Paper text:
So-called major pilins polymerize head-to-tail into the pilus backbone, with ancillary pilins added at the tip (adhesin) and base (anchor). The [name] GG genome also carries the genes for another pilus operon called spaFED9.
To study the effect of lysine and catalytic glutamate or aspartate on isopeptide bond formation and structural stability, alanine-substituted mutants were prepared. X-ray diffraction data were collected for two mutant proteins ([name] in the M-domain and K365A in the C-domain), and though no isopeptide bonds were present in each, their overall tertiary structures remain unchanged. For the M-domain, continuous electron density shows the formation of a trans isopeptide bond between Lys186 and Asn337, with a catalytic Asp242 lying nearby. A cluster of 12 hydrophobic residues surround this isopeptide bond. Functionally, the K–N isopeptide bond probably brings stability to the M-domain by covalently connecting the two β-sheets of the CnaA fold.
Residue numbers in the entry: 37 to 52, 55 to 483
The structure:
Amino acid sequence: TTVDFTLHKIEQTSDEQNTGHDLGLTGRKPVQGAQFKIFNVTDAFYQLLENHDKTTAASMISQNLGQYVNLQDPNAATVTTDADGLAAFKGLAAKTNGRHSVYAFHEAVTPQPYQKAADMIVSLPVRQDDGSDLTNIHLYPKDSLVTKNLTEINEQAVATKDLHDVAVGDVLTYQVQFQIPHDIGALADHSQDTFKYNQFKVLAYMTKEGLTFKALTAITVDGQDILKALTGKMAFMSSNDAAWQQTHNYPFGFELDFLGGTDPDAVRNLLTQYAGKRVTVAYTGIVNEKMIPDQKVGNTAEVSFDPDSKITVNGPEIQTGGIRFFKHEAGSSKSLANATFILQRMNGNVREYAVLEGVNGMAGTYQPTKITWTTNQDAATRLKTSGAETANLTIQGLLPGRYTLVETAAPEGYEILDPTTDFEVIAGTWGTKTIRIANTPVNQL
């Protein structure tokens, strides 16, 4: 007599069981391209069963399957999940050497950006509220999705999306969610003293200049803050440290390893308490003067447990606005230096004026570290034009929206023509055109 195993590979995004029956239209998301191997573990299971009870025997095999079977086995039948997450092992022996057969299921390959489902075993038979046994046994393995996201801007929450308009000086809270393996505390297969896992590296980075690393806000799992307990027992590094430029050359980022630090055994035990559960690693970065327009910068995140393999996920991109002006003489393209402006906006029937930080010495181009807005007009930063050729006043790090450039003082020898120049900042770009501004020469005597 024979038996079938239908697998229903599903996505997991939270903390979470196999009745053996079909659960029908569950309304959950499938996972295609996950290879599972099958192993008959009957003999090895029953040899364990002499000393240990059934739950203990199963636990023992769940961790360290490669101890009890050969995982790199050509003989072992492999099945890959299809577009609906379906995969079936057909035609297995319901009994093996006089006992009801016990089969194990190892996820051999696990697609991006998913962590593997636990190694599960099934001891036959599975029976119902009438004593009849199943012929086809439905299993619902769970691949935990690795995510990355931008969650807060200046400590305020924001609607999740793939492209965020920022302002220079903004603090951006990013997050990386991922699973703690169910076999984290396990020892290596065929080893008494060495551990299975000896690396648990999370590596976030931008390949472009926009951000500057601030901090590592929190680490949370099961609604518990871990970081406070963790810090000093794990290897940590940001792009602010000189160690970063040796191992990487990414402009921004950080690399945390739980099992790469001073006290890896201590952490492994803590990690085991929440084994299987999903952690979240929050970190902040600040938008610097090197964040420019016509630029979309995301970060990536590389979760890994060895140098050989890694799970890579991408978060949302960020861009910021800029604008150029060309202050000229009326009826020519002669550049006019030392024309004085201030930047204005409305804030609901109320006028505000821009104050720029980190802006001294700068004349033509302005590349501030922050911008704030005051109703006291005399406190606004007075902008000066250069003698530059195609554009002699540029400003960056603005949010998209509507502004007004207000000429406070014309350059000497000239009178103001258009005192108030209304203009729109376009999302993530320098804008449609460089905005020309004429000035009338007064032929003085």
